[PDB]
Amino acid sequence: RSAATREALITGARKLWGLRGYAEVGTPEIATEAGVTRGAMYHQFADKAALFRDVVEVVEQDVMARMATLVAASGAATPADAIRAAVDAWLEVSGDPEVRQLILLDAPVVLGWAGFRDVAQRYSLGMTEQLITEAIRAGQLARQPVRPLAQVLIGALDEAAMFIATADDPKRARRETRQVLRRLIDGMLNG
Amino acid sequence: RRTQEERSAATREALITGARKLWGLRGYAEVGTPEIATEAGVTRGAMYHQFADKAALFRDVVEVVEQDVMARMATLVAASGAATPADAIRAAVDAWLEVSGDPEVRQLILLDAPVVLGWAGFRDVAQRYSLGMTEQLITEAIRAGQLARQPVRPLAQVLIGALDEAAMFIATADDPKRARRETRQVLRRLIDGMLNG
Numbered sequence: 001r002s003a004a005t006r007e008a009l010i011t012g013a014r015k016l017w018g019l020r021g022y023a024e025v026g027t028p029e030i031a032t033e034a035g036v037t038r039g040a041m042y043h044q045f046a047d048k049a050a051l052f053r054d055v056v057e058v059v060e061q062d063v064m065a066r067m068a069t070l071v072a073a074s075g076a077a078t079p080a081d082a083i084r085a086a087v088d089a090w091l092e093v094s095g096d097p098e099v100r101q102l103i104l105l106d107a108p109v110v111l112g113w114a115g116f117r118d119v120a121q122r123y124s125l126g127m128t129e130q131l132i133t134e135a136i137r138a139g140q141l142a143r144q145p146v147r148p149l150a151q152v153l154i155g156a157l158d159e160a161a162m163f164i165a166t167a168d169d170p171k172r173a174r175r176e177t178r179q180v181l182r183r184l185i186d187g188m189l190n191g
Numbered sequence: 192r193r194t195q196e197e198r199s200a201a202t203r204e205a206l207i208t209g210a211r212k213l214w215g216l217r218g219y220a221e222v223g224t225p226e227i228a229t230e231a232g233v234t235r236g237a238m239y240h241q242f243a244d245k246a247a248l249f250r251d252v253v254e255v256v257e258q259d260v261m262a263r264m265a266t267l268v269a270a271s272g273a274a275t276p277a278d279a280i281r282a283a284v285d286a287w288l289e290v291s292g293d294p295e296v297r298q299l300i301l302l303d304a305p306v307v308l309g310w311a312g313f314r315d316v317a318q319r320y321s322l323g324m325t326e327q328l329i330t331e332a333i334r335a336g337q338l339a340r341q342p343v344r345p346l347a348q349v350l351i352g353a354l355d356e357a358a359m360f361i362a363t364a365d366d367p368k369r370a371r372r373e374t375r376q377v378l379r380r381l382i383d384g385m386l387n388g
Contacts, residue, residue, distance in 0.1 A: 113305030113313065117359075144380070145373040151360045152353050152377055159352025162314075163345065176342035180349055183341065187384025 005044050006054070008034035013055045018098040022052060022106040052110050059102050060123045066093050067127070079135035080189045086131060087157065087181050091174060094161035104165040124154055140190045156184065203241050205231035211252050215295040219249060219303040249307050256299050257320045263290050264324065276331040276338075277388040283328060284354070284378050288371060291358035301362040321351050337388045353381070 012033035016025040027048055031041045045051040070089035076082040093099055108116045128150040135141035160177045167173035209230040213222045224245050228238045242248040267286035273279040290296055305313045325347040332338035357374045364370035 108310030148373045148377045152357050155356025156349050156353040160349055163348045177345040180345045188380055
């Protein structure tokens with residue numbers, strides 16, 4: 001029955017931390033926002049960061065979901081266009097100030113470096129290894145060790161997003177970084 | 192009163208050097224600051240007049256290790272005898288794979304520093320040290336026609352994300368000598384893809 005409490009808390013936390021950042025909202029305010037007492041919260045979550053970790057899992061589920069929606073909606077013929085769409089998708093979604101706030105800004109501080117690496121690993125890595133293997137098997141990409149490439153691309157993409165997120169002129173930085181990523185990948189991709 | 196100040200400058204350096212050695216070998220976590228004070232020729236009070244806490248001393252250790260990583264980078268690149276900006280860039284990536292492979296660097300910079308400094312703190316370190324060098328190389332490649340005119344800082348920023356991830360993928364690998372080789376070819380392909388020469 002406590003499964004329900006969990007979800008009301010996660011939902012409330014996501015909304016409030018979404019709008020005002022981890023720092024600006026405390027857990028009592030979230031408990032009110034959910035239909036829950038503080039004791040019901042502390043039966044279910046050890047501390048602020050544990051609740052935040054579950055908020056990230058749910059935000060990631062949906063960032064993954066959006067990614068696959070935007071990529072499918074782009075009408076990509078081949079693995080090369082699939083990859084090309086995937087990068088555009090990631091630039092839009094990471095630009096959404098909920099994602100920007102929770103994932104790009106708060107999560108690195110609240111989770112470690114260690115903790116944060118693992119989140120991108122869980123969610124992106126397989127999807128990225130997937131796309132690459134398809135590009136290789138379709139002749140659009142040289143046969144190469146798949147995980148190192150993937151691992152490196154993830155470093156490039158996450159840094160792109162955070163460069164933007166923190167930029168002096170964010171709408172400009174998005175556009176330029178978009179072309180930069182496109183050139184980087186269009187360099188390796190056959191067609 | 193000169194000689195307490197001079198002795199204090201001297202203490203600072205023995206502490207930085209001692210911390211670097213000990214944390215170099217066994218990691219931030221496994222060595223405590225009292226052990227470092229012994230290792231130097233210093234008392235606890237001499238340490239705490241010069242460093243507020245463990246992490247402050249660690250930050251100074253990072254600065255000195257970075258100075259040398261930067262220094263080595265420029266030494267390896269110059270020593271490679273690269274004709275053009277393209278070869279310069281090519282050498283720079285090989286150099287970074289060797290230097291980051293140095294177990295001191297691996298330990299202090301690739302593993303400990305991200306945990307001890309924040310995300311925020313750690314970003315700033317790569318920014319300070321690499322960014323200019325990377326923007327430099329790129330601008331030369333562009334000005335020499337070996338690279339399309341592009342916004343320079345975004346590209347640089349992105350390449351740094353790629354390189355730092357390369358090094359850490361290796362640093363943490365089940366088979367590190369293999370992971371270095373594969374990641375080397377990966378980076379080479381990525382840059383040979385963009386570079387005209």
